[PDB]
Amino acid sequence: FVIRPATAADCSDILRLIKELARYEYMEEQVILTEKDLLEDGFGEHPFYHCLVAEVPKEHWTPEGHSIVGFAMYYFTYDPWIGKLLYLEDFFVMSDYRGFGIGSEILKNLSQVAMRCRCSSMHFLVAEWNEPSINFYKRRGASDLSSEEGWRLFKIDKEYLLKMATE
Amino acid sequence: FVIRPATAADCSDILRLIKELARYEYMEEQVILTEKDLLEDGFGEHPFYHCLVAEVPKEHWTPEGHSIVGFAMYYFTYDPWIGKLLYLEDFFVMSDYRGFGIGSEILKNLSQVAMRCRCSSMHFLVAEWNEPSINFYKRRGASDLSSEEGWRLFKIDKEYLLKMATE
Ligand SMILES: CC(=O)SCCNC(=O)CCNC(=O)[C@H](O)C(C)(C)COP(=O)(O)OP(=O)(O)OC[C@H]1O[C@@H](n2cnc3c(N)ncnc32)[C@H](O)[C@@H]1OP(=O)(O)O
Ligand SMILES: CC(=O)SCCNC(=O)CCNC(=O)[C@H](O)C(C)(C)COP(=O)(O)OP(=O)(O)OC[C@H]1O[C@@H](n2cnc3c(N)ncnc32)[C@H](O)[C@@H]1OP(=O)(O)O
């Protein structure tokens, strides 16, 4: 297999993989992003996300005829105390393509991206019940991050943003 | 007062305000970012953060002779399901300058930044004990975000990133 940065041509594949992840998590209807959205947010002159994809030889394409079987979606964030961070948002490999070393390689690639960018750390969320992924991550140096407890996460949606913006 | 985007010249002020926030939270020693860090991460050819600052007339400078009395540090993030988000990382106004409407104006500015960028929402963390800030935010449309529970936040620090990067 090959792990490479995505191209505008892979947007179709990214949306498909994003939907597989959502379905794996039983929330597929939650995905309202469109292919057009990804192309614009990801390959426009200013990307709001970066993506790595795992491509397999055409001989081993998915039954649907897809060469892309995995991806990692990330962006850089900032911590006023320590600086640059690489934030891994989504990470998924299609069932039939797991346990082959694709995910490990994607993580290796991300780690290089992090060092090249001089990020001091990579952060990410893992569902509490997902022992397999927790083990995967902790076998590769991951540790628990306690910076968020004692804190509440809030959101201000578009309706109120617009109101505030125009008061 | 004036709310404006920061300039490379304000880095000194940003670091000072970042340290006041840390001290307000009793963690000032945690700030290891340098002025040089901010200049590079914030005004280099690619910013890892954006900042708004509140400037007051020289007549009302701080005892230390500073015109900058508040700031907001943010960056854009991405949610594979809904797209672009504006993430507010740090938000602080010096004690003697609060209750004047500076914070409200900063939030108004951020909301416009969010709409201009077509973000569907603005996310941010508030310490659980901080009822004053919770009220401030909820009076302006904020609501609780439940997307993170049932999830654990992990980190992979530089040591392991480098190892993985070079295995
Ligand atoms: C920030 C986040 O978004 S975290 C959410 C991550 N995603 C998920 O949990 C969704 C479901 N899971 C997946 O999509 C995948 O399993 C991933 C992305 C977690 C991992 O990717 P994969 O390609 O399956 O795994 P990879 O093949 O590198 O596997 C490493 C594990 O497989 C085994 N393995 C790796 N290569 C091989 C191989 N060639 N032969 C046999 N076994 C192998 C290893 O023993 C390793 O085990 P460990 O985790 O106990 O150390
Ligand atoms: C993502 C995060 O980082 S959240 C962490 C936010 N930070 C903190 O909690 C640190 C400590 N607090 C602060 O630094 C500040 O208080 C901030 C940033 C939270 C708010 O900024 P400020 O400039 O103080 O507030 P501002 O003056 O706009 O005040 C709005 C409140 O003050 C009152 N107020 C505003 N303008 C005036 C005025 N001209 N005259 C009298 N009262 C006023 C309002 O009643 C309003 O009350 P409400 O919150 O109950 O609605």
B145 lines ligand 2 (CB under 6 A): no
Strand, coil or helix: B113: helix
* Torsion of the alpha carbons at B130, B135, B136 and B141, rounded to the nearest 10: 130
Residue of B nearest to A127 (CA): B151
Domain span at residue A30? 1-167
Our CA-based measurement puts residue A96 at a distance from the nearest CA of chain B, in whole angstroms, of 22
Let me know: does A21 contact A51? Beta carbons within 8 Å: no
For the annotated binding site of B for substrate, the residues are 24-25, 89, 123-125, 149
In chain A, residues with a C-beta closer than 8 Å to the C-beta of B122 are 155-156, 161
Tokens 């230390």 label which residue? B64
Token couple for A25: 């998590």
Q: Which of B16, B134, B22, B118 is nearest to B70 (CA)?
A: B16
Our CA-based measurement puts residue B10 at a distance from the nearest CA of chain A, in whole angstroms, of 15
Those of residues 112-141 in B touching chain A at CB distance below 8 A are: 112, 114-115, 119-129, 134, 137-138, 140-141
Strand, coil or helix: B41: helix
Let me know: does B133 contact B21? Beta carbons within 8 Å: no
Token couple for A157: 């949606």
- Bridge-partner residues for B79, per DSSP? B83
Number of structural domains found in chain A: 1
Rounded to whole angstroms, how far apart are CA atoms A67 and A56? Answer: 5
A34 part of contact set with chain B, CB < 8 Å: no
A57 part of contact set with chain B, CB < 8 Å: no
DSSP characters over A10-58? GHHHHHHHHHHHHHHTT-GGG----HHHHHHHHHSSS-S-EEEEEE--G
B142 part of contact set with chain A, CB < 8 Å: yes
The structure was resolved experimentally with X-ray
3-state helix/strand/coil string of B124-160: EEEECCCHHHHHHHHHCCCEECCCCCCEEEEEEEHHH
Looking at residue B118, the DSSP 8-state letter turns out to be T
> Which phi-psi region, left, alpha or beta, contains residue A141 (left: φ > 0; alpha: ψ -120 to 50)?
left
Rounded to whole angstroms, how far apart are CA atoms B58 and B62? Answer: 9
Ligand closest to B23 (CA) is 2
Interface test with B, best of A52, A91, A161, A167 (most B CBs within 10 A): A161
Token couple for B24: 């307000």
A124 lines ligand 1 (CB under 6 A): yes
B43 part of contact set with chain A, CB < 8 Å: no
Give the CATH number of the domain where residue A149 resides. Answer: 3.40.630.30
Residues 6+ positions from B162 with CB-CB distance below 8 Å: A111, A115
DSSP characters over A43-103? HSSS-S-EEEEEE--GGG--TTS-SEEEEEEEEEEEETTTEEEEEEEEEEE-GGG-SSSHH
Rounded to whole angstroms, how far apart are CA atoms A12 and A30? Answer: 17
Rounded to whole angstroms, how far apart are CA atoms B77 and A2? Answer: 27
How far away, in angstroms, is B133 Cα from ligand 2 center?
A: 7
B136 lines ligand 2 (CB under 6 A): yes
In chain B, residues with a C-beta closer than 8 Å to the C-beta of A84 are 41, 48
Residues 6+ positions from A72 with CB-CB distance below 8 Å: A51, A52, A88, A90, A91, A106, A107, A109, A110
B54 lines ligand 2 (CB under 6 A): no
How far away, in angstroms, is B3 Cα from ligand 1 center?
A: 47
Let me know: does B58 contact B52? Beta carbons within 8 Å: no
Rounded to whole angstroms, how far apart are CA atoms B34 and A81? Answer: 9
> Which phi-psi region, left, alpha or beta, contains residue B40 (left: φ > 0; alpha: ψ -120 to 50)?
alpha
Question: What size, in residues, is chain A?
Answer: 167
